[PDB]
Design a protein around this nucleic acid. Structure first.
Lengths: 146, 52, 118, 133, 73, 97, 135, 186
RNA sequence: GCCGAAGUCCUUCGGUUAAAGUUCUAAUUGGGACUCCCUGCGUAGCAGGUGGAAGAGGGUAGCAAUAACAGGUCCGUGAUGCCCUUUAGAUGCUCUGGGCUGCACGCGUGCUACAAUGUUAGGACAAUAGGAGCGAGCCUGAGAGGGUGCGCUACUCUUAUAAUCCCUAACGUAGUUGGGAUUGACGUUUGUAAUCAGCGUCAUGAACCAGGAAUCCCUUGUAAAUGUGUGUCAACAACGCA
């Protein structure tokens, strides 16, 4: 047996998270939403990280993930996001601790999204706008058909 | 008198001593008690702390 | 052959303390921003006076307790009695000892020499 | 018709909530296909494979880690099916028997909880390491 | 010991791997580096070259290990 | 009329339960309409030996804080009378909302 | 075997059959982070083996590591930067480092700085205890 | 409760326990109650002596293959490896895994052992299938440590040869030392 | 149930002094398990079993007799006998500086590793504490950091989307993308002070291929792994208590 919904077509909740976030990463590279920053490209995602990311188009797959994670928790702060995307600190002889992500890389995206109107700011963190959550259920019926 | 070295945030400030003890060997700052431990444990039941 | 930041001896002497500290290490320009005044001012008064009186011989010793002063080009080629907690150890200043802590050249402890068994 | 009952492993607590509907079972706000594992997919569906086309279950959770949060949901699904047939009895006693034949954890839960840490040691029962001589 | 395999796939050994690899019912990158004396980084990339053309389906698509078979039409 | 909160705090539970009975009792007489908060364990874990000698043994000293909240609509006339229990180691903060 | 391993460049001899940005790590002064920054800015593929690299491509990579500030680099990510003697930010490489670091140890001994002593005696410098550890 | 099959693939309808042999099968724990969709379970099996019998046998392997000191816990890791054995077992030979599995659990654990002269005692069927699963999984990790090869495969290499009674296997080599020591001491 | 946003015929979110409550949450009063029940063994009791949330002291702690050790502490005390110090160029107290961190070496407790059941990159659930100090959100900078200071006298606001695990890639048995010691410089925070403090950045890239004779801890939510708080604390945990 399998989980079954009502409502016929697909939504942003329904389809799987590894799949959906990469389809939404592709949907910025075609449309020229978000863009890459130009200052960056060599920067570590977080100070704790030991090397640059592998993908070179990594900027968009991050920028997809934050919009996905504004959706699933309604509000999303900057300092809340920075805490999320950090990890353990691996190298040193001592035991390992949770350090945070970079802010600037995440801030750059959440300003770039508010250019194309996909996320308004509000009380508490940022919350995605009528234009925004429409764009997710475009891509849900893109990958729901697939 | 009035010792001229600053002692704002310092182990031998006059707030930091065991109040009863007058000495600072092993101080409990939590909940603003400011009491030395040997000094504490003599008179802990009077304060309303208890073993369970 | 000597430069500090691609700048020679006398043009460091010319440009004064205020522009000099723009190009110390950022450990050290904190010591100039916070807690420079009065104790420090007396030093470069006294290392002017011993420097003036000389002119073959090197000048008299300027003794001082305080170990945590930056060395600046202004006091190059003075003698300084620096306290080890014990003796005012005496160091004539070189150009290569610019932009460093004054404590470094008074080592507070002996080398050791280990003997024998036990 | 509706019944509202809970499961509980370790320090997970998962409530479920039956209605009348059309065979929809929903964790958080989403179908219980989507737990992303392939082991723990098949673990939550052990209740359902044994035995709901009338019912509509709606499950919410807090507490625990990844595993024990699943084991609450197996309790909360199965108990809510049994609690539906009890309220709304012959067939309840025999469908409940199919679960208790399979495994006792789908209804009962377990009362074991972690032992407090004791002094002189890094955990509960371990102690540091002696020297001698 | 120092059992060094090799980082290069040669034009000769490519003609061998077309014949004998799809005869094996289940084979990984691990078992190529036994026989043909090569690095597993090449032996992974050899199998993913063969599956794109024709013959050789991945039996298992699981992360960490991969294990390829024949192509039953 | 400025719906008033009591907030009743104690170390010890028997001494608390007298005051809750009285301040619930008096709202029967005045007839004012009457509307448990979670308790704290202030654990302080001193090493029990004075010196460094002996096996490292630790006494645990929990001070407990029981805390209840009654509240009601009341007209300032009636509330002055109710407030005035007087027990050892009990507190009652009055709070207007 | 059309390609070559054991490829000589910049006075070291970096490996082949070893993917590029790890190959450039065999040079003193380019490490794992800066090697990726060269290749990314080279700019080609980090994964491609140092087996291949046809000499026109190789001539690029040597021009990058000698002239880093010039080739679109931030400068925060540099080996020296703000050197006291030159007062300029450029980063050291190859056989220079083993000889040019030695001067920065040698000058300490001439000063009789506290560091310059502990290099000469062969002890720990930075303020570690040496009661038990280090023997 | 009609299909009832392991990993959602294999079935227990096969495995002919009566067919496998006399004795040994009983402490095997493949008898109906034992069957489960996933070998993961909330164990309560260490409470009173013989409760280890009533758990499933495939679980009991996944617990043994949980060492050493880094892999402790992480069962949810181990049941991937035993899955990715049971693909390699099934799709190579074409037997299904559970039949050729339980034949491995028969022939590993030696009859007899040196009780500390030293005297050669006999064994319980409980202690046979215990020291089946140890001497399989011991050989797997001892092989797989430093070997440039995935441990799912290095399980499947061990596990096939245990059924067919070959001295390739770290299991079935190590019994013939231990059984001969019992024969010598006696 | 209302009013929103998407979906766009009924699915999911966010809000609501708005009507009914208590399954989750919080905590007071009581109930509950006794070898009572059955069968074996030997009255005291024991072993197994059914039922049961729990079964044999329900689990874990706390409290713990008399009788002593010339075991520890006069460096906790306005607890203290005697001895000497007060000849103030003090063994009283205090300021500047230095020590307790000095290293041919020997032992104790610990930490991180020696990898592929792995590391690297990208993506995807806790509890217990503490806080008129915690520090919201939004700007600034690769990064650490910096500026502005909303809420909270706390189940309300805050430290606070933990980490093993999971899922896609990269690597390939090598002292190697394992390992991260030791050194050079720049960028900073805390502080009267960084000369022996912590954090960041780029470089430097060691010993270690599972450890002789020996020894330690442990029986179930235990061991082992895996993080998080708290005590000390201006700043600093590889430590203690949870």
């Amino acid at each position: 047996i399998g989980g079954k919904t009502g409502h016929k077509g697909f939504q942003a909740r329904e389809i799987s998270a590894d799949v959906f976030v990469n389809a939404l990463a592709k949907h910025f590279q075609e449309n020229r939403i978000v863009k890459p920053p130009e200052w960056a490209d060599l920067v570590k995602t977080a100070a704790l990280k030991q090397m640059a990311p592998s993908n070179q188009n990594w900027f968009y797959t991050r920028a997809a993930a934050v919009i996905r994670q504004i959706y699933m928790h309604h509000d999303a702060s900057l300092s809340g996001l920075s805490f999320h995307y950090g990890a353990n600190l691996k190298a040193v002889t001592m035991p390992k601790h949770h350090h945070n992500a970079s802010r600037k890389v995440i801030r750059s995206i959440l300003q770039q999204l508010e250019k194309s109107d996909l996320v308004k700011v509000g009380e508490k963190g940022r919350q995605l706008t009528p234009k925004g959550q429409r764009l997710l259920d475009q891509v849900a019926t893109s990958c729901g058909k697939k | 008198f009035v010792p001229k070295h600053p002692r704002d945030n310092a182990k031998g400030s006059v707030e930091r001593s065991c109040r009863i003890c007058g000495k600072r060997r092993g101080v409990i700052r939590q909940y603003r008690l400011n009491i030395c431990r040997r000094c504490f444990r003599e008179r802990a039941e009077l304060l309303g702390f208890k073993k369970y | 052959n000597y430069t500090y930041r691609g700048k020679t001896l006398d043009d460091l002497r010319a440009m004064e303390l205020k522009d000099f500290v723009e190009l110390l290490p950022t450990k050290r320009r904190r010591f100039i921003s916070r807690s420079f005044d009065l104790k420090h001012v007396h030093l470069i008064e006294k290392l002017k006076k011993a420097r003036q009186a000389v002119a073959g011989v090197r000048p008299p010793v300027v003794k001082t307790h305080l170990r945590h002063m930056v060395i600046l080009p202004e006091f190059v080629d003075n003698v300084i009695g620096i306290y080890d907690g014990h003796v005012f150890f005496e160091v004539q200043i070189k150009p290569e000892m610019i932009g460093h802590v004054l404590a470094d050249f008074a080592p507070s402890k002996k080398v050791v020499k280990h003997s024998k068994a036990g | 018709k509706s019944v509202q009952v809970f499961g509980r492993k370790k320090t997970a607590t998962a409530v479920a909530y039956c209605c009348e509907g059309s065979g929809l079972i929903k964790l958080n706000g989403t179908p219980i296909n989507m737990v992303s594992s392939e082991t723990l997919r098949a673990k939550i569906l052990e209740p359902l494979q044994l035995i709901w086309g009338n019912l509509d279950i709606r499950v919410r959770v807090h507490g625990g880690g990844h595993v024990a949060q699943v084991y609450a949901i197996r309790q909360a699904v199965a108990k809510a099916i049994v609690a539906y047939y009890q309220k709304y009895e012959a067939t309840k006693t025999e469908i409940k028997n199919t679960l208790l034949g399979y495994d006792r954890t789908l209804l009962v839960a377990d009362p074991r909880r972690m032992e407090p840490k004791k002094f002189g040691g890094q955990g509960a029962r371990v102690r540091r390491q002696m020297s001698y001589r | 010991e120092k059992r060094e395999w090799a980082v290069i796939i040669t034009p000769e050994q490519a003609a061998d791997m077309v014949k004998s690899v799809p005869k094996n019912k289940v084979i990984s990158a691990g078992k190529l580096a036994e026989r043909y004396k090569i690095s597993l980084t090449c032996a992974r990339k050899a199998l993913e070259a063969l599956t794109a053309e024709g013959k050789i389906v991945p039996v298992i698509n699981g992360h960490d290990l991969k294990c390829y078979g024949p192509h039953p039409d | 009329v400025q719906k008033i909160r009591l907030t009743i705090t104690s170390s010890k539970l028997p001494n608390l339960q007298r005051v809750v009975g009285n301040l619930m009792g008096k709202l029967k007489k005045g007839n004012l309409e009457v509307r448990p908060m979670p308790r704290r364990r202030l654990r302080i874990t001193t090493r029990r030996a004075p010196c460094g000698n002996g096996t490292e043994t630790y006494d645990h000293f929990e001070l407990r804080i029981y805390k209840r909240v009654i509240d009601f609509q009341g007209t300032a006339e009636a509330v002055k009378q109710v407030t005035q229990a007087l027990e050892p180691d009990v507190h009652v903060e009055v709070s207007v909302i | 075997a059309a390609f070559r391993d054991m490829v000589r460049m910049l006075s070291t001899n970096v490996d082949g059959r070893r993917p590029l940005y790890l190959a450039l790590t065999n040079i003193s002064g380019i490490g794992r982070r800066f090697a990726y920054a060269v290749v990314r800015r080279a700019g080609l593929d980090p994964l491609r083996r140092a087996g291949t690299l046809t000499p026109k491509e190789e001539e690029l990579i040597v021009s990058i590591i000698q002239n880093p500030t010039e080739h679109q680099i931030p400068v925060w990510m540099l080996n020296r930067r703000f050197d006291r003697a030159t007062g300029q930010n450029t980063h050291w490489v190859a056989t220079d480092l083993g000889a040019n670091i030695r001067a920065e140890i040698e000058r300490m001994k001439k000063m009789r700085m506290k560091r310059g002593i502990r290099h000469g005696l062969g002890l720990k410098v930075r303020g570690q205890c040496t009661k038990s550890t280090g023997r | 409760m009609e299909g009832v099959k392991l990993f959602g693939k294999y079935d227990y309808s096969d495995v002919d326990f009566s067919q496998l042999d006399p004795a040994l099968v009983d402490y095997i724990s493949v008898h109906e109650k034992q069957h489960v969709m996933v070998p993961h379970t909330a164990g309560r099996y260490v409470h009173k002596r013989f409760q280890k019998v009533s758990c499933p046998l495939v679980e009991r392997l996944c617990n043994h293959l949980m060492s050493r000191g880094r892999n402790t816990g992480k069962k949810l890791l181990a049941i991937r490896i035993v899955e990715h054995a049971f693909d390699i077992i099934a799709l190579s030979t074409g037997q299904n895994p559970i039949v050729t599995f339980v034949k491995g659990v028969q022939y590993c654990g030696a009859r007899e052992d040196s009780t500390r002269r030293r005297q050669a005692c006999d064994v319980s069927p409980l202690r046979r299938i215990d020291q089946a699963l140890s001497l399989i999984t011991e050989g797997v990790r001892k092989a797989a440590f430093r070997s440039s090869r995935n441990i799912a495969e290095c399980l499947a290499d061990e596990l096939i040869a245990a059924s067919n009674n070959d001295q390739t296997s770290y299991a079935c080599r190590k019994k013939d030392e231990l059984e001969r020591i019992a024969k010598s001491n006696r």
